[PDB]
A paper describes a structure:
A putative RAS GTPase effector, AF6 is unique amongst highly recurrent MLL partners in that it normally functions outside the nucleus at sites of cell–cell contact. Translocations of MLL in hematopoietic cells result in fusions comprising the N-terminal domain of MLL and a C-terminal region encoded by myriad partner genes. Here, we report the structure and mechanism behind AF6-RAS association and its dependence on a highly conserved, auxiliary α-helix. Here we provide a molecular mechanism of MLL activation resulting from its fusion with the RAS effector AF6, and evidence that oligomerization is a near universal property of MLL partners normally localized outside the nucleus, as has been speculated previously.
Based on these conserved properties, we designed an E. coli expression construct and purified the AF6 RA1 domain (residues 37–136). To gain further insight to the structure and function of AF6 RA1 we solved a three dimensional structure of this domain complexed with RAS at 2.5 Å resolution. RAS and AF6 crystallized with 1:1 stoichiometry, and RA1 adopted the predicted ubiquitin fold topology. Further, RA1 presented the same pattern of protein-protein interaction observed in other effectors, an inter-protein β strand between β2 of RA1 and the switch I region of RAS supported by an interaction with the C terminus of α1 in the RA domain. Coordination of the binding interface by a Lys residue in β2 is a conserved element of effector-RAS complexes, mediated by K58 in AF6. Superposition of our AF6-RAS structure with RASSF5-RAS demonstrates the position of this auxiliary helix (designated αN). At the interface are two residues from AF6 αN (Leu27/Phe28, corresponding to Cys220/Leu221 of RASSF5) that mediate an interaction with RAS switch II residues Ile36, Tyr64, and Met67.
Numbering used by the authors:
A (entry chain A): -1 to 168
B (entry chain B): 38 to 48, 56 to 83, 90 to 117, 121 to 132
Amino acid sequence: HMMTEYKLVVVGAGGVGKSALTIQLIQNHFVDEYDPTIEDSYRKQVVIDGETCLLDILDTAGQEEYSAMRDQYMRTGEGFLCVFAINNTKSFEDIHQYREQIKRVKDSDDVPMVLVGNKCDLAARTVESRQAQDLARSYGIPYIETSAKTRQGVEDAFYTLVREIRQHKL
Amino acid sequence: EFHGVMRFYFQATKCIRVSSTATTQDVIETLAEKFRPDMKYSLYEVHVSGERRLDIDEKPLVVQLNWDREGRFVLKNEN
Ligand SMILES: Nc1nc2c(ncn2[C@@H]2O[C@H](COP(=O)(O)OP(=O)(O)NP(=O)(O)O)[C@@H](O)[C@H]2O)c(=O)[nH]1
Ligand SMILES: [Mg+2]
């Protein structure tokens, strides 16, 4: 119908696949090396549910030593892609810490999010699919299993977030 | 030797930890590999007072902390 802009912020622990997911969506390319991110920004225009969406994607730092100005980009963000790795139970538990910080920045319980489980191409799963479903349903957000190595669910994860941002777009 | 974070704009935005010893050539090659593998670019400091190009042996981290200067580093390409 109309042109819309969405500010997506990718959020999660280090080595979880935040950069690899974002680069897959922007460049259709999988990054191999593990380069710890500080704050990376991207812009890409797509069509979601029959409307052109200007997506402004902000890939953020997972390492706490690289995440100084977290409060400022959590203010500017409209939706949050909370990524964990299914082979890393620690990054799954950190999700609640990111969840609460985002609710404190926006100061509301109604913050659009999408829970993302990455590295689904690996067989060494330590987080079952139902564990994340309980956490997602307890938050009231969708859960998407993605693989940045094979592009699985990458488009669905970001597009679902856009649909989650529309629910609170005024 | 110390490290600091620097923001770079290009046409979209990257913040990276840069060494006190990193030259402009190393920074450009780092930014080029971060978005275009198989790696000619130039780095500019931009203020409201004017623009200026950094030399190859120059250290952008030391240039940054030399700034009443809302300067911004920009990566550019002649292509
Ligand atoms: N098998 C597999 N490896 C992945 C996947 N996504 C990322 N990786 C790998 O995991 C490592 C971390 O990737 P990265 O995107 O840097 O994670 P990050 O969340 O951005 N890290 P940081 O928080 O430091 O910026 C890299 O070696 C990358 O190749 C995935 O879906 N599957
Ligand atoms: Mg990264």
